[PDB]
């Protein structure tokens, strides 16, 4: 029941299964491909709170994976280490055969807690979590993955964030500059804008002068 596209002399055509197309030639399996695409390629928002809201927990639904031959580079790729409020892990560490997504400019790594009632976090729109070369229906712990889809055809830094309320609607995130230095995370800040905030604070030297961490408001101006 899975659709396939083909490359014609004109454009990308639907590969039909009811009509046998006698102009479609396949001399070898080396003409077959599986390509990974990111959701950001269709305009989907990448800011952390706008991303985690699209993920959530379920149980009784076992995970499945498929592979890739090739795919898109991610501008924004994610890596989670989320614990339950009691300190236990939300997600199991990724299993053998899983390695992180191969190419990305910015990785958004989030350390934090929140309710995790299921076995796994599943994508709410049905998108796949993309690992090195495998797509998965679930998020695995500690592994870098892109958010996306797969098509079948016939022919770098990391930003750390802290989090609370990971599994809730009312949540909060911080951008990390230093161990005791945080700023409130806001959706108007792109990875570059956030790094500019890191340059400003780090360079001025006006960092926490107490034993605990302090959080900066960043003025909306």
């Amino acid at each position, epitope marked *: 029941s899975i659709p396939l596209g083909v490359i014609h002399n004109s454009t990308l055509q639907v590969s039909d299964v009811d009509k046998l197309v006698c102009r479609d030639k396949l001399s070898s399996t080396n003409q077959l491909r599986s390509v990974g695409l990111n959701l950001e390629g269709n305009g989907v928002a990448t800011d952390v709170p706008s991303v985690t809201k699209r993920w959530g927990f379920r149980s009784g639904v076992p995970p499945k994976v498929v592979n890739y031959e090739a795919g898109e580079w991610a501008e924004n790729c994610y890596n989670l280490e989320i614990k339950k409020p009691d300190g236990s892990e939300c997600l199991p560490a990724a299993p053998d055969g899983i390695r992180g997504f191969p190419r990305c400019r910015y990785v958004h790594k989030v350390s934090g807690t929140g309710p995790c009632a299921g076995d796994f976090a599943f994508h709410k729109e049905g998108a796949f979590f993309l690992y090195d070369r495998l797509a998965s229906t679930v998020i695995y712990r500690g592994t870098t993955f892109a958010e996306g889809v797969v098509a079948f055809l016939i022919l770098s830094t990391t930003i750390r964030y802290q989090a*609370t*309320g990971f599994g809730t609607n*009312e949540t*909060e995130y911080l951008f990390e500059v230093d161990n005791l230095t945080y700023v409130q995370l806001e959706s108007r800040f792109t990875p570059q804008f956030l790094l500019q*905030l890191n340059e*400003t*604070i780090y360079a*001025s030297g*006006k960092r*926490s*002068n*107490t*034993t*605990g*961490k*302090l*959080i*900066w*408001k*960043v*003025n*909306p*101006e």
Partner: antibody
Amino acid sequence: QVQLVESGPGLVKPSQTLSLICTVSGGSISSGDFYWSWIRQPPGKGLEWIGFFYYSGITYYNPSLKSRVSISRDTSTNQFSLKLRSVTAADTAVYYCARVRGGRITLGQGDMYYYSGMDVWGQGTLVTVSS
Amino acid sequence: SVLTQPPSASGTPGQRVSISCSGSRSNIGGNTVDWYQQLPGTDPKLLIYSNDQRPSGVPDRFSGSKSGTSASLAISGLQSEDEADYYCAAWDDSLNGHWVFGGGTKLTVL
């Protein structure tokens, strides 16, 4: 370490300007990277903030007093003071001078703010407003 | 006294107790919330800052949280020395940097 010590008349008459001064020692609230403030606690009440002043000249005031309160300082004496015009019976309170943690204040290019808040209290001076 | 706090709280020594705080997005849902402990007869001391950080000198029984426009102080086993007026506070953005304290909660040790 830094002391902030209140001084004033104790008894102030209704309608005059109340003027309380804080003497600072052990550091310099008036010229270092600090905010400081005045706070009052009427007997039987909670803590009501009066106003802030950042050493470079940045101020904030309680909305109920925006038309009544002025905070200023002399960096040559390391003293600062609170002036409240038209003092009334409702203003009887223990007035405190207070320090906002210093070195905790980021002022940036525009779209930046601080991470500051309060730690050190003065002793408190009771101001009675009466005839 | 903008941030709503219960007028009182109580428990026996060793009891886990807590004090709530409630405001708006201009304050609690804006900035972080600090807490102060005012022992009878004296000025309040910073007890909690940045929602859950302890000032040096504050014991491990003190903790807290922030969510939405609500906040909370908790004591993981109440001591007799904790009888106090507790206050929550944060910067109020709608008033352009107004410092706001809550009403103050009288915690009684039983």
